[PDB]
């Protein structure tokens, strides 16, 4: 099977509506104040839950 | 008559005369009537019933306010029973398993276990194609239809999500009722996974 008709710019853009990246779970790190991912170790200060690790 | 409970599991019971019958154990902690609906206010007659007390942290201010009328803890399940005598029920009233008696005929409603994405063979019990003799057609859903419509008729059954449907089994028998343990033993097997909600009602056909 092959495309009977080429896809127009508008239809192509509509389909890609949901083809987007997302960034979730960022919040300030308690120890150093930098942004970190919740439930992850802070890459900057290497502290999690207020302790160095 | 009706009650809400949880599908505890299945076992078997020896009746008098020693016959062995499979039973489903359904627990029903006393349900509570949370609201009474009437023709005047809602246009139809029914009683709202709550079941399975819920931890407070899991409840909402609106939900707590809703159950305050009945003066009970938040309930995990809420369902409306129709075809009952409103005069016999009032907000805050309790419903216990003893509402039924052994040998009662009931309809049991549950939510069937989910199977997820399933093919046509399992989902609709269609026939496979031959597995040999050069066949390259084993578990496929058959022809989609004739040429003329230039389309596929609705209800051409195909693969999809199976289970998770509301199913009622009719004319089950209340084998035993244990008020102390809030248990009803119903002959047979009923839809749903263990710990799921189950609705018992007096059989409509009867």
């Amino acid at each position: 099977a092959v495309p009977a008709r080429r896809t127009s710019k508008a239809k192509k853009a509509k389909r890609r509506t949901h083809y987007k990246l997302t960034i979730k779970g960022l919040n300030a790190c308690s120890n150093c104040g930098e942004m970190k991912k919740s439930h992850h170790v802070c890459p900057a200060c290497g502290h999690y839950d207020g302790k160095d690790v | 008559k009706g009650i809400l409970g949880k599908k505890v599991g299945m076992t078997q019971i020896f009746t008098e005369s020693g016959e062995l019958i499979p039973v489903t154990v359904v627990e029903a902690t006393p349900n509570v009537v949370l609201q009474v609906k009437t023709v005047e206010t809602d246009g139809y007659e029914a009683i709202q019933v709550g079941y399975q007390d819920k931890r407070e942290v899991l409840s909402n201010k609106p939900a707590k306010g809703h159950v305050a009328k009945a003066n009970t803890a938040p309930k995990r399940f809420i369902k409306e029973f129709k075809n009952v005598e409103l005069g016999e029920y009032e907000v805050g009233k309790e419903i216990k398993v003893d509402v039924f008696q052994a040998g009662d005929v009931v309809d049991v409603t549950g939510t069937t276990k989910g199977k997820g994405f399933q093919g046509a063979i399992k989902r609709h019990g269609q026939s496979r194609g031959p597995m040999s003799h050069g066949s390259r057609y084993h578990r496929r859903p058959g022809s989609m239809g004739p040429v003329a419509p230039n389309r596929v008729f609705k209800n051409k059954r195909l693969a999809g999500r199976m289970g998770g449907d509301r199913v009622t089994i009719q004319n089950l028998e209340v084998v035993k009722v244990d008020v102390e343990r809030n248990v009803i033993l119903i002959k047979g097997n009923i839809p749903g996974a263990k710990k799921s909600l189950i609705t018992i009602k007096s059989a409509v056909k009867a």
Binding site: - | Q12, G18, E19, L20
Partner: protein, 122 residues
């Protein structure tokens, strides 16, 4: 679970030794027959001097099967072989003697004569 083309031993001296199933009577689409059911069968191997002889289309009742029966009390019975008895239209066995044990399910099916002749009813 006896179906078409399934072969059974013969549990009597009617003359046939091994029969082959032609039909499972009792329904339009019925697929399988179990103990106490009647079948149409053909004799595939017969005793040289017997009454019933090879190639004859006969009726028979299944008296024991590998997949046996479930009793109301929750017990089960299973045998080591599938055997049938050739019978007349009135359920009377064609032979004079029955060999091997027989399942009690025949009584309620009203094969009383076979039950009496059976060396043992289980």
């Amino acid at each position: 679970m006896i179906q078409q083309e399934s072969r059974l031993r013969v549990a009597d001296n009617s003359g046939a030794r091994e029969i082959l199933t032609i039909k499972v009577l009792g329904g339009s689409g019925r697929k399988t027959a179990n103990i106490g059911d009647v079948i149409v069968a053909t004799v595939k191997q017969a005793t040289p001097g017997g009454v019933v002889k090879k190639g004859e289309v006969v009726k028979a009742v299944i008296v024991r099967t590998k997949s046996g029966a479930r009793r109301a009390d929750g017990s089960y019975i299973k045998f080591d072989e599938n055997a049938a008895v050739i019978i007349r239209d009135d359920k009377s066995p064609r032979g004079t003697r029955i060999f091997g044990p027989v399942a009690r399910e025949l009584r309620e099916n009203n094969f009383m004569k076979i039950v009496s002749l059976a060396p043992e009813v289980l």
